[PDB]
């Protein structure tokens, strides 16, 4: 009507896929278009992506895609979205930088309009304008966003914590306060860490903890962290340098992040601090610092190979100290444990866990979330970037801060928020969903495919194959059983004796034979094996 619409195509009720939109009449601003990693249950899948059908049926209106920060769950689905619409993209220097590299691997670099913005840029459209304010997060150069529309102003926090002693440029509190004063129709705030009451430890503190390790450790330092945390990488290098240590880098994403961190200016280091892979074994233990990936136990990554049997250039020598400057993402806890066990078994010493202060969340806890709420004055409030419980708890925070429960909307992907100064409500849905990605396939693999993968994976299969030349109705080869994932000579006989009685009979079509095979083999296997393999007959006419 005469209101503004706000909605998510992904990012609500989940961590990942974060793609949000604000739409006013014929103009529509997109915020983020990330990717999501498949939960274990989606057997073959590589990535998950939002259903863009609405954005497609409305491409003409899309005025731009803006990028809060450069994390995969914000930036990662952009190649896939750009295959289905061609729209202009705006972001900070680091996000655009990372997306550039990404669009090469996909080819779509040539034909997309990449825009780099900064604190002070405003991009105006007919009846809609977009401004920015700096925040703090687990990656450099992160912005929140203000979308001005007639009915009022919408604010997107991006992903944020508060850090009063940051490694990077301090979050713009002055500007956030202004934004609230100027008036704010609705706030989309990061809900991820809303269950934690504590105030997020400062990166300054982990830096201190890093330097402390570098002074105490007598041998090699193997330091595993997240490639995307440029500032943390900076602290590690400094520690290494300031302790007369050289740095070897392991992992395409690590090299890739350091390279882009170096250009662009987040990483500065002297001359011969960096070292080549062969050079390691030469120098003394206490001058080597290996900086790799695999802090989540992912078994293809650097650290896991180093521990788990062997990697090429690096082996664990007793006295080595490995540092997990991370925290296990849910479900990776077993992976990480395995790695740690191996490292210990291989004689290393491990520094992991919370009692050592070598990690912090990139997402603010309750006090930080409430600081946002009291810097902006949202008439209305929509929790984003979290599972249901994170959204719920976030809302308790907002009601506790005075905003009425009837002005708080905990939503799902696809629901739409009708926003106007004197009224707001969930006014209906939009086409939404999840779209799967295995190999070069993009939405190419349905559920009916995944049910097969599941069935296979629990039970196995047994293939019954026969050649029959059905003129004098005779079985001229077989039946042969070939099985996988199931464990059959007795069965090969059962299905033979019986298949012969079925040919003598002879009024035999094709589908009835497949059925006669299945319908008499299955129960015999179940009898013997209490299992239920996928049994599938193949007939050859010869």
CB 536, min distance to a copy of itself, A: 7
CB 330, min distance to a copy of itself, A: 5
**Closest among 293, 295, 385, 386 to 332, alpha carbons compared:** 295
Residue 189 or 339: the one with the smaller Cβ distance to a copy of itself is 339
Is residue 498 annotated as involved in ligand binding? no
Alpha carbons 161 and 190: distance in angstroms, whole number: 9
The verdict on 71 binding Zn ion (CB under 5 A) reads: yes
Residue 3 or 200: the one with the smaller Cβ distance to a copy of itself is 200
CB 529, min distance to Ca ion, A: 10
Footprint (CB under 5 A) of Ca ion, residues 122-181: none
The two three-digit tokens of residue 240, written as one number: 């290494």
Residue 227 or 373: the one with the smaller Cβ distance to a copy of itself is 373
Is residue 144 annotated as involved in ligand binding? no
The verdict on 438 binding Ca ion (CB under 5 A) reads: yes
Does residue 467 contact residue 477 with C-beta atoms inside 8 Å?
yes
Q: Distance of CA 149 to CAs 23, 58, 187, 420, 424, Å?
A: 9, 19, 14, 10, 15
**Closest among 301, 300, 339 to 323, alpha carbons compared:** 339
**Closest among 30, 21, 24 to 128, alpha carbons compared:** 24
Is residue 438 annotated as involved in ligand binding? yes
How many angstroms from the chain centroid is the CA of residue 142?
18
Angle at CA of residue 340, ends 336 and 341, nearest 5°: 115
Is residue 156 annotated as involved in ligand binding? no
Is residue 352 annotated as involved in ligand binding? no
Q: Which partner, Zn ion, Ca ion, a copy of itself, none, binds residue 73 by CB below 5 to 8 Å per kind?
A: Zn ion
Residue tagged active-site, from 156, 231, 352, 363: 363
Q: Which partner, Ca ion, a copy of itself, Zn ion, none, binds residue 467 by CB below 5 to 8 Å per kind?
A: a copy of itself
CB 529, min distance to a copy of itself, A: 5
Footprint (CB under 5 A) of Zn ion, residues 132-171: 159
Alpha carbons 151 and 161: distance in angstroms, whole number: 29
CB 295, min distance to Zn ion, A: 16
Active site residue 352: no
Active site residue 51: no
Q: Residue 4: in which H helix or E strand, if any?
A: strand 4-10
Residue tagged active-site, from 51, 141, 163, 190: 190
SS3 string, 53-76, reads HHHHCCHHHEEEEEECCCCHHHHC
- Angle between the N-to-C axes of helices 230-241 and 252-262, in degrees from 0 to 180, rounded to the nearest 10: 80
The verdict on 38 binding Ca ion (CB under 5 A) reads: no
Alpha carbons 280 and 497: distance in angstroms, whole number: 68
Q: Which partner, Zn ion, a copy of itself, Ca ion, none, binds residue 541 by CB below 5 to 8 Å per kind?
A: a copy of itself
Residue 241 or 466: the one with the smaller Cβ distance to a copy of itself is 466
Can you spell out the DSSP letters for 112-124? Answer: S-EEE--TT--EE
Beta strands in 422-532 (DSSP E): 423-426, 434-437, 461-469, 474-484
Binding span for Zn ion by CB under 5 A among 71-79, 324-332, 371-379, 401-409: 71-79
Give the residue numbers marked as catalytic: 190, 363
Q: Which residues are annotated as a binding site?
A: 44, 46, 69, 71, 73-74, 137, 159, 359-363, 385, 438
User: Residue numbers of the site for Zn ion (CB under 5 A)?
Assistant: 71, 73, 159
Q: Which residues are annotated as a binding site for substrate?
A: 359-363
Q: Which residues are annotated as a binding site for Zn(2+)?
A: 69, 71, 73-74, 137, 159, 385
């Amino acid at each position: 009507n005469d209101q503004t619409a706000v909605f998510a195509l992904g990012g609500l009720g989940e961590i990942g896929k974060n793609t949000y939109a604000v739409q006013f009449q014929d103009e529509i601003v997109l915020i983020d278009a990330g990717i999501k990693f498949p939960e274990d249950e989606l057997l073959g899948i590589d990535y998950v992506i939002p259903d863009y059908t609405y954005l497609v049926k409305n491409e003409d209106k899309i005025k731009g895609l803006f990028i809060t920060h450069g994390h995969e769950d914000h930036i990662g689905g952009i190649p896939y979205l750009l295959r289905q619409v061609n729209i202009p993209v705006y972001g900070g220097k680091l996000a655009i930088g990372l997306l550039r590299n990404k669009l090469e691997e996909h080819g779509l670099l040539r034909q997309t309009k990449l825009n780099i913005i900064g604190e002070d840029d405003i991009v105006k459209f007919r009846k809609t304008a977009v401004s920015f304010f700096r925040t703090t997060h687990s990656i450099p150069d992160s912005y929140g966003i203000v979308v001005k529309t007639p009915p009022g102003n919408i604010v997107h926090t991006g992903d944020f914590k508060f850090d009063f002693t940051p490694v990077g440029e301090p979050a713009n509190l002055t500007k956030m306060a202004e934004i609230g004063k100027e008036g704010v129709l609705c706030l989309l705030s990061d809900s991820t860490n809303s269950e934690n009451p504590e105030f997020t430890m400062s990166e300054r503190r982990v830096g201190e903890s890093i330097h402390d390790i570098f002074r105490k450790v007598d041998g090699r330092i193997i330091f595993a962290t997240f490639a995307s945390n440029i500032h943390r990488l900076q602290q590690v290098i400094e520690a290494a340098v300031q302790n007369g240590r050289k740095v070897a880098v392991f992992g395409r994403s690590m090299e890739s992040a350091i390279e882009i961190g170096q250009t662009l200016g987040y990483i500065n280091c002297p001359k011969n601090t960096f070292i080549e892979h062969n050079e390691i074994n030469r120098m003394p233990a206490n001058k080597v610092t290996i900086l790799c990936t695999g802090s989540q136990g992912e078994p293809m990554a650097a650290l896991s190979r180093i521990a788990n049997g062997t990697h090429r250039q690096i082996s664990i020598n007793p006295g080595d100290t490995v540092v997990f400057s991370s925290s296990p993402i849910p479900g990776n806890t077993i992976s990480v444990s395995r790695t740690i066990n191996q490292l210990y078994r291989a004689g290393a010493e491990v520094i992991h866990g919370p009692l050592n202060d070598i990690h912090t969340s990139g997402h603010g806890g309750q006090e930080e979330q409430k600081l946002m709420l009291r810097l902006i004055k949202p008439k209305f409030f929509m929790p984003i970037h979290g599972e249901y419980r994170m959204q719920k708890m976030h809302v308790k925070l907002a009601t506790d801060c005075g905003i009425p429960e009837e002005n708080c909307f905990i939503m799902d992907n696809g629901e739409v928020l009708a926003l106007k100064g004197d009224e707001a409500s969930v006014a209906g849905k939009i086409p939404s969903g999840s779209v799967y990605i295995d190999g070069s396939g993009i939405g190419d693999i349905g559920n009916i495919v995944l049910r097969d993968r599941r069935i296979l994976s629990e039970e196995g299969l047994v293939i019954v194959v026969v050649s029959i030349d059905m003129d004098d109705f005779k079985i001229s080869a077989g039946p042969d059983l070939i099985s996988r994932g199931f464990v059959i000579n007795d069965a090969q006989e059962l299905i033979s004796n019986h298949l012969q009685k079925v040919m003598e009979r002879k009024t035999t079509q094709w589908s009835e034979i497949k059925n006669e095979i299945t319908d008499t083999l299955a129960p015999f296997l179940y009898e013997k094996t209490k299992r239920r393999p996928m049994i599938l007959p193949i007939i050859m006419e010869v």
